[PDB]
């Protein structure tokens, strides 16, 4: 019978050490079966529904909970909500500001004047003069991300408790909701990487034969259309400037990690998508979408909202990138998307719970696969 229960975290490898402390290697997550079985159920029919599926809600809840617990014991940055004296960095003849703070030291009677660099996106002016505030002081306290904790996605298997089973649909063309004819039983799912992104889905599983378009109600413009690609497109992303990290004491064993001086040239973060692969991929998506509308299909840049929705938000290397995709949703060159980086984050629309992402020294290079798109809709077009 159909049921909703508690599933457990399982992983493939125990190759993860205790230095990295990956949140998806919690040491509270069990190993899975190294030689898993799958039983094909012959002569059965099962109705699957991805939009009403409760495994999705449970995965979502586990992730939010995991992040809150991981950040629970780490340093609070409420002492930094002080007037910031900021000027531009010597990237002169943009987006990085050199700010001075008055910070209480381990001895409560004294404050020290210290400096840090901030990205423009994290700092809001108070005055028309050189007087600024961090963007969160207006709404919430910031918890500093734990400097020793990796948030790199590790494939997680969701496995059934005793008395329960997980059915898998093996119809290659299965789309949204409806019957699946080839059904099999497993103890658990394949590993799923908990990758966070907003416009382009990264590092997922590709469709077996063709682009598959999935929606709850394809005629409702308010619904997200999830497009699964049958071929991946690579993205090369980087953070080209060499950062340094400045450790600032803000209390008795309470350390704040500030961006220190930038070494060498100051350059803009960016992502590289091959033009030819993108062109055929986006055109194939328009072709497949057409089968459900019979209209000419075109793409446009997003309409507006905050950066999480208007840009391709993603994490890479622990850094948080917001890339401009107007050049995608519109030769043999490479499409280079400018990207911005920010450290003060409110994940999953949970306004009121801010996080500060400490700087990473050195340079960052990312390689990732676009495996799908999240699209919405607004004529013979």
């Amino acid at each position: 019978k159909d049921a909703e229960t508690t599933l457990f975290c399982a992983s493939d490898a125990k190759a993860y050490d205790t230095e990295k402390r990956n949140v998806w290697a919690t040491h509270c997550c069990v190993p899975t079966d190294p030689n898993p079985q799958e039983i094909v159920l012959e002569n059965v029919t099962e109705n699957f529904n991805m939009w009403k599926n409760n495994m999705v809600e449970q995965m979502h809840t586990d992730i939010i909970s995991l992040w809150d617990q991981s950040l629970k014991p780490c340093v609070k940055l409420t002492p930094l909500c002080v007037t910031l004296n900021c000027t531009d960095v010597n990237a002169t003849n943009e987006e990085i500001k050199n700010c001075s703070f008055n910070i209480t030291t381990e001895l409560r009677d004294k404050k020290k004047k210290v400096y840090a660099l901030f990205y423009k996106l994290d700092v809001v002016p108070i005055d028309d003069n050189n007087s600024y505030r961090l963007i969160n002081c207006n709404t919430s306290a910031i918890t500093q991300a734990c400097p020793k904790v990796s948030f790199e996605p590790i494939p997680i298997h969701y496995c059934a408790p005793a008395g329960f089973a997980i059915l898998k649909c093996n119809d290659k063309k299965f789309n949204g909701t409806g019957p699946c004819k080839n059904v099999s039983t497993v103890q658990c799912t394949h590993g799923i990487k908990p990758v966070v992104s907003t416009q382009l889905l990264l590092n997922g599983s590709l469709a077996e034969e063709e682009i598959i378009i999935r929606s709850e109600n394809i005629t409702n413009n308010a619904k997200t259309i999830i497009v699964q690609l049958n071929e991946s497109v690579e993205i090369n992303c980087t953070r080209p400037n060499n950062n340094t990290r400045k450790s600032i004491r803000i209390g008795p064993g309470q350390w704040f990690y500030a961006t220190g001086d930038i070494i060498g040239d100051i350059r803009q973060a960016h992502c590289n998508i091959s033009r030819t692969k993108w062109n055929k991929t986006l055109q194939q998506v328009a072709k497949k979408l057409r089968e459900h509308f019979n209209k000419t299909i075109i793409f446009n840049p997003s309409s507006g909202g905050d950066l999480e929705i208007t840009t391709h938000s993603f994490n890479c290397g622990g850094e948080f990138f917001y890339c401009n995709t107007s050049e995608l949703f519109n030769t043999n060159n490479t499409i280079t998307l400018p990207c911005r980086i920010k450290q003060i984050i409110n994940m999953w629309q949970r306004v009121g719970q801010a996080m500060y992402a400490p700087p990473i020294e050195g340079k960052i290079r990312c390689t990732s696969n676009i495996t799908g798109l999240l699209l919405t809709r607004d004529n013979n077009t």
Partner: antibody
Amino acid sequence: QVHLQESGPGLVKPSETLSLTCNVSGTLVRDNYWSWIRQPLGKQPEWIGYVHDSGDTNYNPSLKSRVHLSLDKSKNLVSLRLTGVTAADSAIYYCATTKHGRRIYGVVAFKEWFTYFYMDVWGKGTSVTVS
Amino acid sequence: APTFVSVAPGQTARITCGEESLGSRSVIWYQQRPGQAPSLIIYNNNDRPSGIPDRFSGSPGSTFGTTATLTITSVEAGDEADYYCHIWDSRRPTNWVFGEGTTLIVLS
């Protein structure tokens, strides 16, 4: 070859306008960038400014308000004019050809590059003093 | 303004000029013999215009925190001169004034 021959009054008075020229021979005045260099006696030289066609002219910010440069396409001369002459303007003045290149350090599309200039053919220069 | 280097004929001289770099640089070096207009030795760190021998070779503009250096190997008596650098640094305003030079004295 290219010869640049400077010419001027030699001695001018304070608050007078100084006007120097440069007879260009072997090239046409609009073929390259021109620049003027000033070397106070015993000091390292200063770049006064550079002039070219298409409006690509700029001046040393410390002099800019008192300086004008131009190309005479009829006489194939390069001119330099300094107003408000003072004690600080006593120097050797030189006419030189300017060539350039580009240094790229990042993404070209993001303008992560700069133009640099160097002086190739130098004239002999003239000595200009004030009193 | 100038500093000094004393080099015996045939020895290598090391001439430095300018402050520590911040970003990528294109350094231009000029040589001034007494009584003469200065002339170009190298541009873009290592590019010699025709007529300049390969005994004149500069430091790269690819690193940071260093200073411009012109190495003159096998110094000849004819190399006695005031050497100046003009530093174009990607993180600083155009430098309209050449840096203070070095007088290279050949001890001949």
